[PDB]
């Protein structure tokens, strides 16, 4: 996360770290959506241009974390993966269209002060909140700048950007399964996700019921926090039919 701040304790209790077994290293962010299911970006698991194609046994998820590097004894919980599900129409070839994946845990994780699931948006909450100017929050342990790494979880609040502005900022083909967020060059404030934040959540707090909803997944950007560029996020609601299908048939 670029130009963010240290998270407060328990600020993002749905935050999940995707952790490589060997070598032991951070792979990505992710989010807890129930006691057995974790949501992330497809490119965290499958990205052929970078020779990335992880299997279940390659990975762990670490839940309830704050420190990036410490083993947080008595606080974090570490889970093995039973199964990975990637969206069947995930487009890793071109533009990361439908950049979404689910991971089912081998065993349910116990909730605590530091571990708690985020909500997924219904159609109405999505319609109400996914509007240009409305801010969401992005969290992760990724790089602090494009060209370094945080001691603890970072957080940054960023405004959703008008779709034409998103489109005009890039040569990449944007789709309805993405939205973009970030400040404009003139606005003064700045901030962005960066490498390592991939797969983490873009959340919004509904003013209707005071619950946190995951509207987006950290997906892609040209560099990090570049003027005139924006961060692109998987549109969780647009792909919720797939999410529900997977959970309903495999859990």
């Amino acid at each position: 996360i670029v130009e963010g701040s240290d998270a407060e304790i328990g600020m993002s209790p749905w935050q999940v770290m995707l952790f490589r077994k060997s070598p032991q290293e951070l792979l990505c962010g992710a989010s807890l959506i129930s006691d057995r299911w974790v949501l992330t970006a497809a490119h965290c698991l499958l990205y052929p241009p970078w020779d990335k194609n992880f299997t279940e046994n390659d990975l762990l998820v670490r839940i309830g974390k704050h420190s990036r590097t410490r083993y947080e004894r008595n606080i974090e919980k570490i889970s093995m993966l039973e199964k990975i599900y990637i969206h069947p129409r995930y487009n890793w070839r071109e533009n990361l269209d439908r950049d979404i994946a689910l991971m089912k845990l081998k065993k349910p994780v116990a909730f605590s002060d530091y571990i708690h699931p985020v909500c997924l948006p219904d159609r109405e909450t999505a319609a109400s909140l996914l509007q240009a100017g409305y801010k969401g929050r992005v969290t992760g342990w990724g790089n602090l700048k494009e060209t370094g790494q945080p001691s603890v979880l970072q957080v940054v609040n960023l405004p959703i950007v008008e779709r034409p502005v998103c489109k005009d900022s890039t040569r990449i083909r944007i789709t309805d399964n993405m939205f973009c967020a970030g400040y404009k060059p003139d606005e003064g404030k700045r901030g962005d996700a960066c490498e390592g934040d991939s797969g983490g959540p873009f959340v919004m707090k509904s003013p209707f019921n005071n619950r946190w909803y995951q509207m987006g997944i950290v997906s892609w950007g040209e560099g990090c926090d570049r003027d005139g560029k924006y961060g692109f996020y998987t549109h969780v609601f647009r792909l919720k039919k797939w999410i529900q299908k997977v959970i309903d048939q495999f859990g």
Binding site: K21, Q24, L26, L60, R62, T69, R70, Y71, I78, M80
Partner: peptide, 11 residues
């Protein structure tokens, strides 16, 4: 850079 995690999770 990372602190080692308990072996039980790598077994």
């Amino acid at each position: 850079d990372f602190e080692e995690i308990p072996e039980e999770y790598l077994q």
